[PDB]
């Protein structure tokens, strides 16, 4: 059939891509990073503990001032936290109790959330009428939202569980563009530093580098072997790290277009759910389901540190923009902040 | 020493007071998940969400009909639920083997392992008339080796073949539920159809809360 010759062509194209990736694969990152000293036993320890929520904390996002931090829990609350002095700022009640994501705006003005209600809701913090108000209620995805990140004050990128990411204009209220091409639920996205091309990890073990100003998937990465639960761009925007239910992290490179490092371990049989880099880009923090987190060395692939702590599975993890602290949020209603 | 930061800490204490009030209204509400492949318009008589009240107990029902069928990521979010009201058309093609696999995947998923399942078998009159004019034995060869349990109460009026098929489906769900379980969560089957099924959900949820309170005193 003609479908058969199209599948033969797609198989030839996978062969051509694998050949091109093999041709540019001279020395792995484990090889040319033997001459670097390791980091050592990093005794990161709980500094603050933001014990305010009622249900499990499902997501978290820091402010860009490195002090405020939104946590969204599934008690229907989303509360901004002042990390430096562990006191609340706002406590926003939501519409649907099941939010699966949140996002603090880089301008600090808005906070997004969204979940099983298939709607990214954007709350306005800096209103002159007192209490926070839902400023925008973006409803175009057909499945649940899984992650959302503000590009700037005016436009928000979302990913949903209906194989679509989407760039939305908030002032108008609809999708500026879509991003289709996934075959499973898109569990997370991560912006670049220059905020021009982001990545998305999904439930088909494939991370896509999209282009925001066009809408086309320009690169596609297949290293993992189960549903990618988290993704985070490297601090220069040339690489990114992922993690999945296959108990591994994977550092991919955009320009090299293939997988560079596979952070796995024998004692790790639990899926992982949240990754972030430190400010240098050396510690790949990765929160797992075995109630711990792990401070991998992005160049030695050794477990440089192990974040202890949480009493139920960590669910989200975020490093401040000045790299000062790492906040983890778990299903035991607690946020931990680590230095 | 907290110049106007005192007023910020006082604001945060008022926030904590409001969240204490929300905790008091939160744990007094029983979240339960309606998951099936009507049974829902018999409940609001007193689109996703539902808040109803039985005997001054707040029950909270979320339906997930506006998602896709890839269930494995959005069903983790209901780990803090009190019960999964599972609905299966008892005359399902073979949709009910899909229902058995869905129940088994609910029952064994490592975040739903503390969640009891209220099992509803709708369309029992459809199964009754299908076995009457019949079908089910073509799908299930293990149904030949099956005997109706003696403690199984006969619903007065229905055929014995209806009872043996009915309690076969019930006990087969029970076999899939008890094949792997630490006693940490059970299954509560019923048979609907029409009248108020919500009394069974009330009694069931009270059974789940009581078994959890008993086995957190090591009494079970």
């Amino acid at each position, epitope marked *: 059939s003609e479908l058969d010759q199209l599948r033969q062509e797609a198989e030839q194209l996978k062969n051509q891509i694998r050949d091109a990736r093999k041709a540019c694969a001279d020395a792995t990152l484990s090889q040319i990073t033997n001459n670097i000293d390791p980091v050592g036993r990093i005794q990161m320890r709980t500094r603050r503990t933001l014990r305010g929520h009622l249900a499990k904390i499902y997501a978290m996002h820091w402010g860009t001032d490195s002090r405020l931090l939104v946590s969204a829990s599934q008690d229907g609350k989303l509360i901004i936290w002042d990390s430096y002095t562990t006191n609340k700022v706002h406590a926003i009640p939501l519409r649907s109790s099941w939010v699966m994501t949140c996002a603090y705006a880089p301008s600090g003005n808005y906070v997004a959330c969204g979940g099983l209600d298939n709607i990214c809701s954007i709350y306005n913090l800096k209103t002159r009428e007192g209490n926070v108000r839902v400023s925008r209620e973006l409803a175009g995805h057909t499945g649940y939202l899984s992650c959302c990140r503000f590009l700037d004050d005016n436009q928000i990128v979302t990913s949903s569980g209906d194989t679509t990411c989407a760039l939305w204009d908030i002032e108008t209220g609809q999708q500026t563009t879509t991003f289709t091409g996934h075959t499973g639920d898109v569990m997370s996205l991560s912006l670049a530093p220059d905020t021009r091309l982001f990545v998305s990890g999904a439930c088909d073990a494939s991370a896509k580098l999209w282009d925001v100003r066009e809408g086309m998937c320009r690169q596609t990465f297949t290293g993992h072997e*189960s549903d990618i639960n988290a993704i985070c761009f490297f601090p220069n925007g040339n690489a990114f790290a992922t993690g999945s239910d296959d108990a591994t992290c994977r550092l991919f490179d955009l320009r090299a277009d293939q997988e560079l490092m596979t952070y796995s371990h024998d004692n790790i049989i639990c899926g992982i759910t949240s990754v972030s880099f430190s400010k240098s880009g050396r510690l790949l923090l990765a929160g797992y389901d075995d109630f711990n987190c792990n401070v991998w060395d992005a160049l030695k692939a050794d477990r440089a540190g192990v974040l202890a702590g949480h009493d139920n599975r960590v669910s989200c993890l975020g490093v401040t923009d000045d790299g000062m602290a790492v906040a983890t949020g778990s299903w035991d209603s607690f946020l931990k902040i680590w230095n | 020493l907290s110049a106007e930061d005192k007023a910020a800490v006082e604001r945060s204490k008022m926030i904590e007071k409001q969240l204490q009030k929300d905790k008091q209204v939160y744990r007094a509400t029983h979240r339960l998940l309606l998951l099936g492949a009507s049974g829902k318009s018999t409940i609001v008589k007193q689109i996703f969400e539902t808040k109803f009240q039985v005997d001054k107990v707040n029950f909270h029902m979320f339906d997930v009909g506006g998602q896709r069928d890839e269930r494995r990521k959005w069903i983790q979010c209901f780990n803090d639920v009190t019960a999964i009201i599972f609905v299966v058309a008892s005359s399902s093609t073979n949709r009910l083997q899909e229902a058995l696999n869905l129940f088994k995947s609910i029952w064994n998923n490592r975040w739903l392992r503390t969640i009891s399942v209220i099992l509803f078998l709708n369309k029992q009159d459809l199964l009754a008339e299908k076995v009457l004019a019949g079908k089910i034995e073509d799908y299930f*060869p293990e149904f030949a080796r099956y005997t109706t349990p003696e403690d199984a109460t006969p619903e007065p009026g229905e055929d014995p073949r209806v009872t043996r098929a009915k309690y076969f489906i019930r006990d087969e769900f029970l076999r899939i539920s008890t094949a792997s379980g630490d006693g940490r969560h059970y299954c509560y089957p019923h048979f609907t159809c029409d009248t108020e099924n919500i009394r069974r959900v009330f009694n069931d949820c009270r059974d789940i809360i009581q078994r959890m309170h008993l086995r957190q005193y090591e009494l079970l």
Partner: nanobody
Amino acid sequence: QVQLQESGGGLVQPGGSLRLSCAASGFTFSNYKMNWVRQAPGKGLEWVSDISQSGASISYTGSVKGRFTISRDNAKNTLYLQMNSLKPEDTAVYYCARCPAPFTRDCFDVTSTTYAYRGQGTQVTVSS
């Protein structure tokens, strides 16, 4: 990359036998439990059979108890389904589908023609 290349299957005599297979590449085949899933023409996808990680725990659907037999070779990284005494209602397109998580028991993989850890499948026809 998760790749599930199937093999074997086509026109076959009712009452006859067949053995179809799935070469599974791109993942550690021993960590996952596997399934055979079928889609009859017109009907949606339905589950057929499960085999666990070590191959110990094994399961079939109702309609094919005794007639089929699933097996797995973790050394060759492949998944075999031996069918015997095939019936004309058992014509379908067959699918090897792995459950999406390692080291677990739960499976969510018979979805509405969108589950990426499931191969292209082979037409298997019982006719005369």
